[PDB]
Design a protein around this nucleic acid. Sequence first.
RNA 1: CCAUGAUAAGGAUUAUAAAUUGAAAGUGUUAAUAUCAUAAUCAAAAUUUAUUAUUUAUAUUAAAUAUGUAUGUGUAGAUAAAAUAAGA
Lengths: 487, 55, 154, 623, 136, 55, 177, 160
Amino acid sequence: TLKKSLAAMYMRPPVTCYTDACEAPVAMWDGAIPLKETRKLKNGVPVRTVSRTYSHPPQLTPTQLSFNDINSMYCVGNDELIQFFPEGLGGRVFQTMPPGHPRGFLYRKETHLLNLFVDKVQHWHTKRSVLSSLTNGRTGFIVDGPTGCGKSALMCQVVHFARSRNIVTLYVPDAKVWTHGEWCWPSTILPGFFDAPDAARSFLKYFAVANRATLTSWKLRCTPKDLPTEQGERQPQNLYELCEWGHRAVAPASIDRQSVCVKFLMDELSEEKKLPVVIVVDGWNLFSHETHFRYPHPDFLRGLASFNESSTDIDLYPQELPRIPASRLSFVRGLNKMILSGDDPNKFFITCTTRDFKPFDGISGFPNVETDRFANSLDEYAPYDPEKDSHFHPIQIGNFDEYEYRSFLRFLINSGELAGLGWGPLWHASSDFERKLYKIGFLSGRNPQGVVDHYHQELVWRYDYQRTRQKQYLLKRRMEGMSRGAS
Amino acid sequence: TVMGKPLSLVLDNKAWLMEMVLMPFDEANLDYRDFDAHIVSEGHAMPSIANEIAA
Amino acid sequence: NTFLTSSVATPPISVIRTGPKWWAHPERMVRQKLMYFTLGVDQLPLRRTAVIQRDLQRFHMCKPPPRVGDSTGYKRSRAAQLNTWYRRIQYQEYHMQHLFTRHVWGLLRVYPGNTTKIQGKADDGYVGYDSVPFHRYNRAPLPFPARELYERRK
Amino acid sequence: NYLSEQDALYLSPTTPEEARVPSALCPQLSACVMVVFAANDMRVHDNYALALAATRAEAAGGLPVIAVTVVDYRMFAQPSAVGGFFRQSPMRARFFLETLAALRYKLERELRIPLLVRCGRPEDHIPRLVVECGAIDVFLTTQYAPHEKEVHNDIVEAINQRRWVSRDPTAGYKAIEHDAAPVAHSVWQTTLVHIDDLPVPVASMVEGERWYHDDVTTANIRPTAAFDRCINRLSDLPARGDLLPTTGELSGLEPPPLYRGRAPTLVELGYGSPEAFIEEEVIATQSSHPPGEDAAIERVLDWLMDGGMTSMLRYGRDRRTNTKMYSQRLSRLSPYLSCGALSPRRFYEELRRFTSEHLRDNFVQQQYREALLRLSRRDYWHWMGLRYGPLLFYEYGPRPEHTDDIADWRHDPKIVQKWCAGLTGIPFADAAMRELTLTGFVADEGRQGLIWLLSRGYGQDWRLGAEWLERCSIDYDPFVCYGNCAYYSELVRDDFGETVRNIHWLAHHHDQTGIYVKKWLPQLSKIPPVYIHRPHVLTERMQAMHGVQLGKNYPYPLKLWDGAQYTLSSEHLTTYFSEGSQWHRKAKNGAGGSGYAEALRHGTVILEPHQLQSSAFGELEHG
Amino acid sequence: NKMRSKPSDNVAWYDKGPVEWLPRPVRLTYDHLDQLQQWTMRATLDGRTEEFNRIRDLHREWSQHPLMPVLGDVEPKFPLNLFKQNHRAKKRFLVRWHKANTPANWLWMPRGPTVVTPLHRTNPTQYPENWKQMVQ
Amino acid sequence: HRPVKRLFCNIGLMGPQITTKARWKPYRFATNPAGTSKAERMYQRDKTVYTHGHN
Amino acid sequence: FPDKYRRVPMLLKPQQGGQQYFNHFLIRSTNDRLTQQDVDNASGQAMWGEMPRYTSDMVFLYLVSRRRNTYAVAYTYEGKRILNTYTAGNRGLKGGDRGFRSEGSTDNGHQVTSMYLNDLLPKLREMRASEGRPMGRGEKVELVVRVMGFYNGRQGAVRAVQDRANEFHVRYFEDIT
Amino acid sequence: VSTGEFDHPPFQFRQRHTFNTTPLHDANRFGGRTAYLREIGPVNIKKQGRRFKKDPRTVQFNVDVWCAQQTLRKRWKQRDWEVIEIPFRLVPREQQRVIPELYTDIPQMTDPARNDFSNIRNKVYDREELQGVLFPAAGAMLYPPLQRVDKQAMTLDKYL
RNA sequence: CCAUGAUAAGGAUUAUAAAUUGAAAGUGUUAAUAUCAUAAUCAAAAUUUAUUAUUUAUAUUAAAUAUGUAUGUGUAGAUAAAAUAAGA
Ligand SMILES: Cc1cc2c(cc1C)N(C[C@H](O)[C@H](O)[C@H](O)COP(=O)(O)OP(=O)(O)OC[C@H]1O[C@@H](n3cnc4c(N)ncnc43)[C@H](O)[C@@H]1O)c1[nH]c(=O)[nH]c(=O)c1N2
Ligand SMILES: Nc1ncnc2c1ncn2[C@@H]1O[C@H](COP(=O)(O)OP(=O)(O)OP(=O)(O)O)[C@@H](O)[C@H]1O
Ligand SMILES: [Mg+2]
């Protein structure tokens, strides 16, 4: 009767933001998230009211984040997420935030360090000496670690920090779409260079809508005034106008405009010396090495009359030409130009390395299409050493420790139950949090991707007898209690 | 570690197979992260031993 | 999807009777849970059938209790009631799985197998590149460019 | 529009070269002997017209044989007289077209006889083709039914008078232009006992089934070997290979030559919105009807071999008992006998041979006599329909003297809709209607139950039920169907015959266990046999135990019990044809499914609309 | 050996429920899961919540707890005949019964506006996308 | 189909996607003539010619 | 017939998990018992005779069950036939699909009697209204049941007449040999 | 280890496409290589049918060779190096030794006295240091010197 | 032309509770067939001759000559098989 009274008398707290709004009805998380009566002095009299024992982590802006928030969970509003991430998130970052679930992030030591670094970059001319000391003379940092770490999530956090401080930021959430893209096309104005039209058009559109506030104030310094323009369309005087011109076009004319817009945008950024620019590429190891595209067969570049007598084998035997290096891409060329060339103290590359390659451990049969978690994984099988393959300072990121793992798992389980994505009414079917924390830690090894996977895989646990034993014990207790009452 | 590879990789990160290996450390009321264990395969070697009987 | 050939249909009772081999296969159940979670909806029927399958598989080895001690008047009827209730819950989960698979196919522009219905854009069973020139169950002749269900771009 | 374009293509004053039968090369082959096929006969084994044409060609010399079949376009897409039902529903139309294709294959590949298929008016197409081909003798069977007897008379008159037809207006012309005095031979081959052999005249025939059975006891049946010999010798006659289809045409790579003809389809005939004509129910029966003549012969042989003779009478009984409508041992030969693919003489010869072979058994003679009795009953219904003439299709039956107790035929569109959709409360009637709507065939007891329930049980007009059975049943014989409907609607009340039994009596008699109802409506499987045939009697507890919730599934009966207006409300009495019903949500535009005024709602080609039809459509729109 | 044009029991019904009854088997892969994740990310970034609302409505309609069957309510079983093994008859009976038992005619599932579902939000306005509309 | 696939592999502008992501028509469906528009075309080819499905 | 899992050990059929929780449960039980003792101590410190007399409005119903048949008939007090006899053969149940053994069974008698009563009620109302005797809005007709035969259909017939007790009220239940 | 399949499924009665069952030669298996073994359509064994597509041994060898090709390509994709013959005088001390042939000795180790125990046959040397030996005549500035990060430097990662 | 042996089909029942990881498949007969120990006029190279458990729709003939005809909504009747590392 007491629990029924608590559920009936529970009153939902006032909604303050998206994080407070996402909350399932009381009957969903009644058992998963218990309730207790607390005395609150609403009018100086401690009226006893029913309140939850758990709440979603606070939604704290990057400025509000401080040293005391390290190894703790915070949330970002849905509108703030939309405004600051038009391109998207990392390859596997968004898996933990469905529409009902709150968007939450863990504030780690590296996250705090990069947040301070972005704060110093905000006014880079005054803090130039300390920034150079932090990067040891390199043009930014590169995050490296094993598969499953918080690498992509850290890059998303850095983008959030840069966007919240009104800094021009290039974001490539998935570098696979450039190197291992759908198709490749030679550059129209750059001889000997290629590009991926699909990724480039998306990059132009999303960069425009992200920094529209700043790119409109940006003025064109190295850009011709005779750009090809259709009737009724205004000439671009701002960088945002240039980006809109490049991406908003009817096919196939958008291909050539995009190939031109990327070249001119790179020139405009390269000719900037007073504004801090942050460039975040998730998976820079793909740009370091060659792309999966191969050079066209030369017989496609001369024309044939008949296949019989033409000294050609294009139609008879497929052959592998040397793969096109990423350094010949237009986007990559501009990045490499800004890196290798000096006198660029305002551009900082906060990049990362992806290790999402397909597994290969000596023998490789044919993976089952029905069950294969690596359907979209890269077919690289290539070792990568950031020290020898990047000009940036390498930062090594390992798996979660005990504190971060506990905070991450507590957020996942309890926020999911509160949002209506957990056991809910079947809370008693699974063990308590301590058993979950212990068991999942063994299953995953405190690898953040493993933690998420085993959090989902908890549904099929078979050998967890904690709840079954408790049910028998409590039933035995109540049977004895009833017998004592009768006697 | 099983045959020089982590248990998660040997069982292909399957919770319903790794929980069987975890069970003795729960029934004995011990801690899994207090002992180093290695498994040596001496029967018929197969590319994948991710199954209930092998577990 | 990648499977586009002709398919036969089986009663839901058969798939439910199939225990921890196809219906209760933990990997398949985890995939269904991921499908529900990425759509941001609760997995209550999936968890119900999961706990039912766990309880059934844990004690499938044990011999049944003596039926002579059990009262055929009441105990057998109670057991039948519980079995039917579990079977109905599993039926609901099976139906939900099929419905959400069709919905996700329609959203993701995934062409299903032959004679498979996707509500909203097929409504009569999409068939393409089949052994029979005519559409099964409809007798409608089929073109060679079978059917463009979705828009071209992307 | 398809009929108009067919008329403008073929029935044109000039008859363009594309729609012209090629002339023969040899001067002898210029003339030929033509045969007309129809829905009454699509066989090549016992066709009297075919045998007579073969004999005529043999007597004349090397005269070729030509076959023509013109489909009656009106019968496939025109609405019914009462209630606007379809005529030749798509289920029947597909079977008809498949049988026509089988006949064409039989004639062109086995007998090497080119068959020319035409679409439109038979009375227009046939004489014009006679004139163009220069046929000397046109052999055809005698149709004696309305819309068939009149067209046959017009055809023979136009053949005698050598009349050309142009169809911009209804205009006829002499044979002076054709840009030999032909004779038409009309032969009687429909009845098992050929006319002019009856022991008593039709005019002075006493109206009685048992009297006709006693007459057929003395009457003889013509053999089939005499006509088979002529059919076999037909092959020796020279044939015009230019009219035969080619390998590409057989493979379907190119359409048939325009002078030959193109088999029409459902859309070409006029069937619109096929999605509304797809019945999504469980087909409990496990036997089908493969259209054709060889298939019909194989079905006859298999039914004889597998012990199907017990379907007539159970072994060692000598008295008719309740039938097993759920069985697969029944001879489903009524479609093949009504469409003419299987000849009654051939079926009788098969029965006689089987009985003679198994005569060592002491009961096969009784079963043979029962089968002959059923065939003679079909012939008797034919004779009674001929006697009644046009009066058979009028209100209150042909004989108003027997209709003293009949009411004034109250007609309700929604009641007719529920009856034709099977949404009644009687499990036997529902199962019979489901079987008829799905398979296109149901047993004699099911037909009796349905017709009696619609006519006398509910008070609705009997013509509505007769036309619905015409629309559904693939074995629709006009005379047999309408005569049985009149007899079992208590319109024709001839004594010394089968009694008209209640639907409840039929359910208790032929389906006492309820296998048939529990098989065709498997949602009622849990109801005990004591409570089947009356599931509305169950209380709430009993219906929850047996898993049959009235109103949700298997609604309440059309005929509520005494009271039932104070203890029931709209929550229990669920509607099935309101504005927000599934029936409206069909046809991909929204008009309805299958039922009242379905031809008006779905059909594309409608000719001569009626005031009653328009008023019914307006009432349906308002409601 | 014999060729039959009989419509087998494997005929699908494309007018009873969003999913055809006796549905064809479906193979849901991790490639499909990844594509769904990408699509959901793009949709939520664009701000179109109509598809999510429709999905939530479908889940609310078809994801309710079945009711407790009264004693005596059980699926029909096939009788034990002495005519050997009527495997085909058993299969036909089972398929026919399950085809008749369409999801629309599932009486144990509480479906419709009349029933109350105290576990899910009734309308899209209650969902957190309308957090600005529920303030102070 | 064979030379088309080989040309797509040789050009390399699409990459290794031809056999991993690209989908192709079946054998007897992709051996149809240029303009068919009907799935009932492979059954309408010449049968007297013994050519193992090559018209 | 043989055991399917004979090769599995008894300790494995089934295996008891959660052995580590038993000690904790025992200690918790000891603590709970101790605090229960503590609170208990705290509370302690703190023509004539038995022959029926008929009425002119009561209808005599006769139910005659046979070895392979059953009959239900009714008569008014004057001695007129309200409705003709309803038999199993008349209803069609005797025809077949169940065998001669099922003839005159409990369910058969029940359904025959139910059909006869349902057809009797409007006929009875018409008969009453013929002589200007309305039945009234609430139909409660008194009938005397007379059962004969000693067969299986007798139980079905008496169950059927017990049914619809709102319309039919049994006044005397007599048996005739 | 590996997770995919290496053995062809066995020959049984015809597998119908349903739940937990796939046709034996469906296009999904082995990527798409069941096309070689697929005998399309219903086959009358009396006359129609190739023997090798039904022989369980030949199809097994075909599956084995396909898996071997897959293993070879996946192994060769790991190669980010080439083998160059050096005149034995310019190699470092860790290479100036008697290196045994493959499969003729226990796996050797590079200078175990230098706390290095890695396999000697899997050592890969970058060109940033070998340009002097590889291209003596070229000289000039080819492959500019590889910058090596200073470990003992107070950068951001050192919590400066 | 040796009539005599095997085989096919094929079943039986004690193991309480604790411990232990343990302590757990057995065939008559009736049948058909056949190449053996038993009774002389004729099968094994020139094979058409009809002898149960087969590959069904992204890619399909290279090493001893190695299968061109049955797509039809997978739709009958009969027949066989198992409680065996599986999950009635
Ligand atoms: C309301 C209504 C409507 C119709 C009919 C009856 C009733 C009551 N009938 C007659 C009867 O329904 C039908 O002939 C048989 O039920 C067909 O089933 P079987 O082929 O299994 O009969 P069965 O196996 O006995 O076949 C023997 C043949 O005898 C003939 N026959 C059998 N019973 C007959 C009967 N009662 N009357 C006439 N001929 C009979 C048929 O030619 C039948 O093919 C009919 N029949 C028909 O051929 N076409 C129709 O359109 C109709 N319509
Ligand atoms: N700080 C964090 N806060 C919240 N979630 C995190 C954090 N770090 C990691 N995750 C979670 O880890 C999962 C995957 O991490 P992430 O995308 O960073 O992997 P990765 O190391 O880049 O992998 P890969 O090698 O595949 O590129 C996601 O579910 C993401 O939410
Ligand atoms: Mg990543």
